[PDB]
Amino acid sequence: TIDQWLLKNAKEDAIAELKKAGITSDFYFNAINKAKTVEEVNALKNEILKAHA
Amino acid sequence: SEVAHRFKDLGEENFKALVLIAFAQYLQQCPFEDHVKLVNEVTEFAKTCVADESAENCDKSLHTLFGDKLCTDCCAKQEPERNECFLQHKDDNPNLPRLVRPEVDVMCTAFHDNEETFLKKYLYEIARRHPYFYAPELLFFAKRYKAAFTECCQAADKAACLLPKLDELRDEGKASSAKQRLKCASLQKFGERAFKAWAVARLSQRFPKAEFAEVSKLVTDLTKVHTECCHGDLLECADDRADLAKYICENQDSISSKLKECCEKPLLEKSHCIAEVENDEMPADLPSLAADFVESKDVCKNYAEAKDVFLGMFLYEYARRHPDYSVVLLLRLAKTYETTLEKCCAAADPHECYAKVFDEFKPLVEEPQNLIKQNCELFEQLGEYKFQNALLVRYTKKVPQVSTPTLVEVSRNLGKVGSKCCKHPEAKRMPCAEDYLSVVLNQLCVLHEKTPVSDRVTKCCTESLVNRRPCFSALEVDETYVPKEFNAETFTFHADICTLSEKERQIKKQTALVELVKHKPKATKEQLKAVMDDFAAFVEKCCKADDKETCFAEEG
Ligand SMILES: CCCCCCCCCC(=O)O
Numbered sequence A: 001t002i003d004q005w006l007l008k009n010a011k012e013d014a015i016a017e018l019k020k021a022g023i024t025s026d027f028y029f030n031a032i033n034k035a036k037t038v039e040e041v042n043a044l045k046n047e048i049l050k051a052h053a
Numbered sequence B: 001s002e003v004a005h006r007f008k009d010l011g012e013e014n015f016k017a018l019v020l021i022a023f024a025q026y027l028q029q030c031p032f033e034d035h036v037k038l039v040n041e042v043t044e045f046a047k048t049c050v051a052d053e054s055a056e057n058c059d060k061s062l063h064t065l066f067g068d069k070l071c072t073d074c075c076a077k078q079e080p081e082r083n084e085c086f087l088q089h090k091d092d093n094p095n096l097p098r099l100v101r102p103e104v105d106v107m108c109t110a111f112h113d114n115e116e117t118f119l120k121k122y123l124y125e126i127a128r129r130h131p132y133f134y135a136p137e138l139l140f141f142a143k144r145y146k147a148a149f150t151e152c153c154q155a156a157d158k159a160a161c162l163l164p165k166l167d168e169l170r171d172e173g174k175a176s177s178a179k180q181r182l183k184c185a186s187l188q189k190f191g192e193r194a195f196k197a198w199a200v201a202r203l204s205q206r207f208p209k210a211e212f213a214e215v216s217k218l219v220t221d222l223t224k225v226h227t228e229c230c231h232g233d234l235l236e237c238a239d240d241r242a243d244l245a246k247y248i249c250e251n252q253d254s255i256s257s258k259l260k261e262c263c264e265k266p267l268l269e270k271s272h273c274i275a276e277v278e279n280d281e282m283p284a285d286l287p288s289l290a291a292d293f294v295e296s297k298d299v300c301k302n303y304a305e306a307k308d309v310f311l312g313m314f315l316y317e318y319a320r321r322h323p324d325y326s327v328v329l330l331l332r333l334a335k336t337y338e339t340t341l342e343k344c345c346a347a348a349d350p351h352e353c354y355a356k357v358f359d360e361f362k363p364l365v366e367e368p369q370n371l372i373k374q375n376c377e378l379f380e381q382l383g384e385y386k387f388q389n390a391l392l393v394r395y396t397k398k399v400p401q402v403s404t405p406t407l408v409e410v411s412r413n414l415g416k417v418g419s420k421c422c423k424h425p426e427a428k429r430m431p432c433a434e435d436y437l438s439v440v441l442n443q444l445c446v447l448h449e450k451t452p453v454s455d456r457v458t459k460c461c462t463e464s465l466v467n468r469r470p471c472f473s474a475l476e477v478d479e480t481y482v483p484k485e486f487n488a489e490t491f492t493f494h495a496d497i498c499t500l501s502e503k504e505r506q507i508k509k510q511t512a513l514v515e516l517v518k519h520k521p522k523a524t525k526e527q528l529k530a531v532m533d534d535f536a537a538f539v540e541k542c543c544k545a546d547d548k549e550t551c552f553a554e555e556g
C-alpha cells in the first residue's frame, strides 16, 4: 500500500486548483495540508471553491 | 441500472424493507396488502434488473419506477416534479388513531402465525405515522422489535417481559423521529447551508481530534444522506449512510478513537452506534482562537476569499473546544462572529472594529446557562408532572391561540427535559437540554404551521432556526387575547378516566388545565396549582366511589 503518496499528491494539486481559482491564502492551503485523508482534501477543496464564487 | 445498483448494494431484505417504508410515507392512507404487493412486484423487477442489467425498463429513473407503481392529482403529473407532489402531500399529524397494542397473547399468536408479515406490519405502522422517520434507523428499531418477540413470546409471563422492552422501544422511536423531523425542517425551510453549519458544530464537538478537512468530508456526506432521506430517496439515502460508515470505519485513525467497538458491528447496528458515540477527548493543548480569528492581520482577507469556510473553520475551532455548549448556542456564536465580520470588514480599521468580538459571546453563553439552571431548580422542587403543569401555564399564557392538543403535547415534552438533563453534571446539561428543546420547539412549529393561528409562534418559527428557543422564552404573556366563553363539559370528566393509565389520565387533567387558562387567563398562579390538586383528587375520589360513577356529574 501507499495512500500517503496519493495523500501528498492530492494536497499538492488541490492547492494548484485553488490557486488557479484565485484563492490566495495559506490559511486555506494550510488546512488542506493538515488533511490526513484524500476524501477530506477533496471535500475541503470543493467547499472552498463553492465558497469563493 | 440504478435500481440494480441499489439492490446490489443493500441486499434483498433491506431493499425490500425500505421500499415498503418509502410507500408508507408517500401514501399514508392506503392498506397493508396494497403496499406489500407493489413491494414484491418492484422486487421481482429488481431481481431481473440485476441479472442483465439492461432489460427494457431497468434503464428507468427510480422516482419514475416508484411513481409508476403507486397509481395502481399526482399521478396525472409530469416528471422531475410529480415526485415533489408526493413529499408535499406528506403531512405531519396524520388523521390516524393510537396503536394501543392489542394484547400480549393476541400479538405473540400473530407473531407466530407469521413471523414475517407481523414484522413487516410494524414497519408499515411506524413508517406511516411518522413520514419523516429516518429510514435506516427504522430498520435498526425493527431488528430490536423482532428480537423482543423472539425472546419473550415463549415465556410464562410474556407480559412482564415484552411490554417494558416494547415501551422503551416506542420511546426510542418517538425521540429518533422528532430528532429527524428537525433535520428535515432545517434543510427544507432554512436550507443546506444551515444544516451544514449544524453538522459542523456537532461533528466537531464529537470528533474534535479530526482535522477540518475530514470534518468537511463528514458534513458534505452527512448532508447528502439527510437531503436524500428527508426527500424520500430512501435507498440512495440508506446506501450513502452505509458508505459514510464505511469511510468512517476505515479512517478511524483520523476521526476518533472511540469507534473500534462501533466499527466491529453488523451494518444496521454500526451506523446507529456511530451516530450516538461519546464525544472524543479534545486534543490536549489548543491555542486560543484569538490568533486566527481576531489578531491575524488577515482575518478579512481570509474571510472575503471564502466566507463560508472561514466561518466554518471558526465554528469547527470553537465547537471542538466546547463539548459543553449546545449546538444552537454554537451556531449563535458563529452568527455573531459573522455579523461582526460583515460589519467590520467594511470599516476603515476592521481590526479595531472587531477586537472585542469575544466579549459579545459572554451574554450569549450566560443566557441559556441561566435559564436551564432556573428550570432545573423548578423541576427539582416540583417533579416531572407539576413541572409540566408549570410549563403548560407559561406556554398557554404566552400563546393561547395555539390549539389545546398542541399545547399539551408540546408542554409535556418541554417538561421531559428536566428528567432528561437536570440529572447530569452542570457541564453536560446545556447540550442535553438546549438541543432537546430545539427538537420540541420544532414539533410545535411544524404542528402549528398546518393551521397558523398565532403570529407570535409563526414569527419565532421563521425568523431564525437557532434563536427559536430564546425567541420563545422571550415571549411575555399575551395580554390582548380574548378568553373563549365557558363550556362546563370540557371541565367535567367521565367514568372512563378511571380505566386509563396514569399518563392518559394525566393528559386529561392537563387538557382541562389548559382550557381553564384560556378561559381565565388573568386569574392564576396558586389557583392553578390548586386546581390540579382538586382535579387529581376528585378523580382519585370519584373512581373509588363504586357509586354508579355518576359522581363525576355530581362534581359538575
Ligand atoms: C456559519 C458557518 C457556515 C458553515 C457552512 C459551511 C460548512 C461546510 C463544511 C465545510 O466548511 O467544509
Ligand SMILES: CCCCCCCCCC(=O)O
Pocket: B222, B241, B244, B245, B271, B274, B275, B276
Ligand atoms: C450524526 C452523525 C453520525 C454519522 C453516522 C451516519 C448516520 C447519522 C445520522 C445523523 O448523523 O443525523
Ligand SMILES: CCCCCCCCCC(=O)O
Pocket: B190, B193, B194, B195, B197, B198, B311, B331, B334, B335, B338, B463, B464, B465, B466, B467
Ligand atoms: C452562522 C451559522 C448560522 C446557521 C446557518 C443558517 C443561518 C440562517 C438561518 C438562521 O439561523 O435562522
